[PDB]
Design a protein around this ligand. Sequence first.
Ligand SMILES: [Zn+2]
Ligand SMILES: [Zn+2]
Ligand SMILES: [Zn+2]
Ligand SMILES: [Zn+2]
Length: 212
Amino acid sequence: ADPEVCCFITKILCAHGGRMALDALLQEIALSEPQLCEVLQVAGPDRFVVLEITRSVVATTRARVCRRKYCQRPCDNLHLCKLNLLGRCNYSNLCKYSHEVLSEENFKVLKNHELSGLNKEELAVLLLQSDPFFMPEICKSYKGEGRQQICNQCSRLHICDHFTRGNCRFPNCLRSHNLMDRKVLAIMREHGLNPDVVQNIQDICNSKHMQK
Ligand SMILES: [Zn+2]
Ligand SMILES: [Zn+2]
Ligand SMILES: [Zn+2]
Ligand SMILES: [Zn+2]
């Protein structure tokens, strides 16, 4: 409920790689177990994903980076260079995406999502595991696991697209929802996402699937 306490939890979580065991989190926030559990439950799975009895908390957000190459303002999304946010922009010729992570316009977007207290490092951790735009490209010719051809040829992800966006309508979906697969982890690793980050994405995407 309290945005200052919530932002503070997001901050501590992002400093520990977007995930913490409930016990290690309690040691940093200095609250009691059902007192913290009240805050997490009230904030909901759009801010914190709680999984199991050894409990872990995963930070998330509804904030997204605008996907357009050239965006006509006003726009309610963040505008930044993903590569720069991750410290890998080898173009800045001038890059068409902002290198000012906490720009005036982004700062307003963060206030709307109650994340204006974050620094650029915490924002990078949060967005990498919450925003699907940070994920490698998904093979458009992939249609499921029990077919003649898995795809038309490729290097892209052979995973359910809708699952990554939190809207897989199929309850017994035959397109893979397992991002923890060796082949997926190999493509993720080459894109700059390590298995700890993929595990967080997996648990956020699992949570979004169980909440329709
Ligand atoms: Zn935009
Ligand atoms: Zn850039
Ligand atoms: Zn393919
Ligand atoms: Zn699916």
